[PDB]
Design a binder for this molecule. Structure first.
Ligand SMILES: Nc1ncnc2c1ncn2[C@H]1C[C@H](O)[C@@H](COP(=O)(O)NP(=O)(O)OP(=O)(O)O)O1
Ligand SMILES: [Mg+2]
Ligand SMILES: [Mg+2]
Length: 424
DNA sequence: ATATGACGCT
DNA sequence: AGCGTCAT
């Protein structure tokens, strides 16, 4: 079995937060520009970067002041600030706009604020028998790249040349040629992407392949404003120089042990190993997953979920701003709870459901662990004061100070999350 | 002094 | 459950 039964696509917005600000502020269009959070510490932290500005080496996580050094024409748009914290509402709403449109073509799984996976298998079947064996016209694929093509014996001319070899080798006879199915999926994604641009003004990229992992890999091969098809046949060469860390779920500790333990560098080298070999190295689940994946085979299904299982608000208090007093802790819990009550009310009305669990998370000054304590209490009413007061209770026994007016050690992070939803 | 949401392990 | 891992 070759892991070619499904057509899966990943759609990801190009420099999402920038496009949202550029739609709103025409003066930012087609300029080096970036979106910044806060302002006081070193101009604010950069969180999204137009492609014009990336050409100067401006990146996410860079301070705005350091970014202006790399690029002094850089324009900045500031994230909105409510009750003393970053407020991402504009971008969540833009995301819903984009998800609604995508939903009209197939069932989607929201994977982040700006991307969704799409299972196109069923829509591919439909469009196939409508064609009645009609060949696929390169007219229908004006922004599609075929990975690994052209091959054998100017940016856009190279694209068409690869696209011509793909079609000129296609087998439109067999209505289950996996390569034909990917080509038809790619035709739908062009329609989906034109509709998103038409109805929002947002441009996006997309990957089309047989599973989530290849779709996501393909999406980033030709950003921005292009889509890439990765066929099962292109996987051996693609993977032969693909660093292991580029693959989703291997960008961290597991991927680094794969490199260290096996002494390899690229995804294609995993094929030498037996599945049993890989299970003893990395456990039974990772070994099986890896054995299949280095052959381009992956089974994670596209889950029909476009809303979330959790709604959270958090704020970091780094350095001098760490929370030292009880009354400081209570004020910020109030602020978090107020924004949280706002989003929960919106979610109970628009999507018809109610949370039953409140999770409270904190980080103390000196703990490397991104969260230090994580406790849960009942959630019965969408009332900020009640939520904020209950969060304090759950954490108040963690102020290790005999002075009760004081909070020690200082808190570096407050996090309030609502979960365990039920239909309402 | 790089705000969020999913899922795995035990 | 609470923690860890990984993602954008
Ligand atoms: N580590 C992070 N932390 C917080 N917000 C982030 C983030 N990474 C991204 N965002 C925010 C800002 C981002 O705009 C948005 C989508 O994340 P991406 O798709 O990873 N990056 P973009 O869409 O900007 O560029 P392109 O896709 O063309 O590479 O979510
Ligand atoms: Mg994006
Ligand atoms: Mg993204």
């Amino acid at each position: 079995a070759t892991g070619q039964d499904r057509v899966v696509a990943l759609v990801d917005m190009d420099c999402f937060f920038v496009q949202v600000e550029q739609r709103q502020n025409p003066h930012l269009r087609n300029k080096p520009c970036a979106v910044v959070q806060y302002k006081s510490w070193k101009g604010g932290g950069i969180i999204a970067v137009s492609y014009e500005a990336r050409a100067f080496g401006v990146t996410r996580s860079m301070w705005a002041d350091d970014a202006k050094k790399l690029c002094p024409d850089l324009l900045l748009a500031q994230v909105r600030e409510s009750r003393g914290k970053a407020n991402l509402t504009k971008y969540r709403e833009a995301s819903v706009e984009v998800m609604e449109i995508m939903s009209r073509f197939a069932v989607i799984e929201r994977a982040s604020i700006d991307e969704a996976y799409v299972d196109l298998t069923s829509a591919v079947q439909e469009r196939l028998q409508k064609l009645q064996g009609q060949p696929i016209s390169a007219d229908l694929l004006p922004s599609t790249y075929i990975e690994g093509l052209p091959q054998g014996p100017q940016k856009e001319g190279m694209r068409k040349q690869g696209l011509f070899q793909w079609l000129d080798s296609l087998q439109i006879d067999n209505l289950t040629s996996p390569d034909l199915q990917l080509t038809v999926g790619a035709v739908i994604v062009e329609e989906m992407r034109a509709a998103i641009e038409r109805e929002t003004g947002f441009q996006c990229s997309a990957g089309i392949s047989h599973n989530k992992v290849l779709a996501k890999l393909a999406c980033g091969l030709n950003k921005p404003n292009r889509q890439t098809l990765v066929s099962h046949g292109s996987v051996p060469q693609l993977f032969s120089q693909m660093p292991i860390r580029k693959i989703r779920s291997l960008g961290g500790k597991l991927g680094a042990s794969v490199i260290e333990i096996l002494g390899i560098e690229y995804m294609g080298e995993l094929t030498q190993f037996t599945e049993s070999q890989l299970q003893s190295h990395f456990g039974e689940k990772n070994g099986s997953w890896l054995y299949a994946m280095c052959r381009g085979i992956e089974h994670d299904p596209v889950k029909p979920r476009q809303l979330p299982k959790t709604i959270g608000c958090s704020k970091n208090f780094p350095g001098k701003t760490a929370l030292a007093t009880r009354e400081q802790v209570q004020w910020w819990l109030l602020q978090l709870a107020q924004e949280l009550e706002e989003r929960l009310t919106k979610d109970r009305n628009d999507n018809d459901r109610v949370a039953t669990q409140l999770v409270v998370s904190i980080r103390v000054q000196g703990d490397k662990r991104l969260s230090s304590l994580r406790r849960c209490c009942a959630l019965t009413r969408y009332d900020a004061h009640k939520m904020s007061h209950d969060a304090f209770t759950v954490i108040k026994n963690c102020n290790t100070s005999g002075i009760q007016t004081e909070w020690s050690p200082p808190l570096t992070m407050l996090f309030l999350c609502a979960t365990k939803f039920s239909a309402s």
